[model samples]
Target: SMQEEDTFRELRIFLRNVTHRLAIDKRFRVFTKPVDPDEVPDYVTVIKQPMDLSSVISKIDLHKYLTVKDYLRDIDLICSNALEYNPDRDPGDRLIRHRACALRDTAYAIIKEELDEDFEQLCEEIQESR
Candidate 1:
């Protein structure tokens, strides 16, 4: 149980850092509703639901998991509508926008470290995909 708690703690910390980076960026306004960094757990919970945690953990254990690309693709698929410009009028739309924005910001935060050379192109790709 201790190990499980430790893992969850680490995951939570990782998510918090991701949320922090996303919060500072203006282009990523997916989580701008209440605008609290502590809301990261809610965002992370949405992400954890669809993502295969077992696969993520296995890849992490191997140290070969390129989290940036993986997370990017995940957000692209799950939160694609977050890039929409229209206001979220419906409750469902609001939730989708929030979750999608969280996912996109998380991906960008990770990718910033890995692909400095092609960062602009990758960001363009994310936008185009939207």
Candidate 2:
């Protein structure tokens, strides 16, 4: 029981920190939806924009991968470069707004890629489901 309680407590702390940082740096609230603290799972799915490989690599659509190796290589690089940019260059409200916009764009890209529809459609589906 102690182990389970400790695990939940740790996750609660981690989520709190993530929420605080996201609020400060991205100017948006986190955890607005309900989450079971005790039933926390690994690998939170971060829905974000598909990396425009064409922009990063000219004249090639990197999405074409015949094997797992090819897929892993592209995914590893995309993730690595996403965090390569500096955030400290921006200040105050500008930083928050910019980060928020970036996140919005990224999320739209990911959802559009996987679901073939935008976030607005997702919201509509959620409303309909309810």
Candidate 3:
């Protein structure tokens, strides 16, 4: 549980910092792409995952999330705000890395769920009685 706790703690810190930055600056757009594996600097490469969708959601109610354009816009805004602080950047630019990281994770989850569901259905058809 320590790992999970630690992750939560770090994420909270990241969120707070990102919110503060947004409150102070209205022009900066916050959205970050996951660090490409080959682009990661040597210092943090150890933490990278080959297929990591750190930009995906863990779980989402598609009905609730996709109900209106405004809802999706809000989600994109939040993600954009978080991405302004990517930690993997140079030390001076790490302010919004956490937000970017969180958004990346959330996005990946949503996409993965869809992909996984489709893949499962395809597999099921292969096993069905011909």
Candidate 4:
């Protein structure tokens, strides 16, 4: 349990690091908050599960993420939601989705370098249970 606690603490730190990177970028600034229904009335209808950088970080501090998979799931969802929403026919498509692609790449790059070892211990415990 102590070991698990250590992994959990480390996971939160990793999430904070990833989120701070995105939060500082101007490209991602718009994604820091929930989409306003008044501005984008169609957003709620289109996006059932909405996510943002601020919310992700909130959950991290709230201790909502049980595993690295859960953390990554939200990270990917934030990108996919943005990518899935075309944000109107801007420049004939490929506008914000382009940024979403960058988000995925950036977040994954950090995860690849930083998350592997932290997750390895959890992986061992999972396999042993199996």
Candidate 5:
């Protein structure tokens, strides 16, 4: 534990904000925690890998992320897993899928809107560092 190994200040701040926002997003509340096996017994079998906002933030703090894209991919998985696990045959499943799509767009937009030219350049630097 040498002084914290943050690649860039921008990434730290950006990810912090993203998780904070997702944590409070009412629509994303259900998707914030790991899916309960009791609620959806088939979840483990259907999705090889499961993801959630809670897990994402923990990994962020654990120094597990290198690229911003990698972090975002986990966020993307939260929604995609929902889509794959519960098909739209039922109205309830369709509603979940709709929210998942919205969550994906919002997650990307949060970064796109906040990331300026300088932050994007830092991301490039992070790319080369790896």
Candidate 6:
């Protein structure tokens, strides 16, 4: 139970960090929204029927969180359109590239945090085997 609580706490922090990063960039105005970390629920409860005492409670799974893959793909398509819209060096192209790079970097940072933890765990396991 303690481990589960820690996991949820880490997940909330990660979500808050990612959203905060996105919200700060003006280019991401259309894509991101401000999130209150404190308001985030550790678990979601579903009530099946009216006045039913029985309820289902499940941990909020981070695996279900949306990624920037499709968003980045759409950005690439927009950049392509910008190229077609003006074959001669359009400013929109530069802006799109800049925003895309920022988004990519932010995504990497978030993922790296998780990967780093995994790597550390793997190293500990290997050391214990010896």
Pairs of colliding residues, candidate 4: none
TM-score of every model? 0.35, 0.25, 0.24, 0.83, 0.85, 0.40
Models sorted by lDDT, best on top: 4, 5, 1, 6, 3, 2
C-alpha local distance difference test of each model: 0.48, 0.36, 0.38, 0.79, 0.78, 0.41
lDDT of 1 by residue, 1-130 (tens): 5544454344445544554565466644444342233844454544433432233334345543233455456446445534353246888667667766666666665856744545444434543554
lDDT of 5 by residue, 1-130 (tens): 1222454554766787888897798987888888899988988898998988888888877766656777888888888888888776899899889888888899899888876756566666766766
Query: After aligning candidate 4 to the native by TM-score, how far in Å is the CA of 40 from where it should be?
Result: 0.8
lDDT of 6 by residue, 70-120 (tens): 223433443343333334455765664555456656655665765356543
What candidate 1 gets wrong by more than 4 Å, as runs, is 34-78, 83-130
Name the TM-score of candidate 4. Answer: 0.83
For residues 6-41, could you state the per-residue lDDT of candidate 4 as single tens digits?
A: 877877887898899988998777778889899999
Clash list (residue pairs), candidate 6: none
Off by over 4 Å in 3: 1-70, 83-95, 114-130
TM-score of 3: 0.24
Which model, 1 or 4, shows the larger lDDT? Answer: 4
Best by TM-score: 5
What is the number of residue pairs that collide in model 6?
Answer: 0
Please report how far candidate 6 places residue 120 from its true position, in Å: 9.2
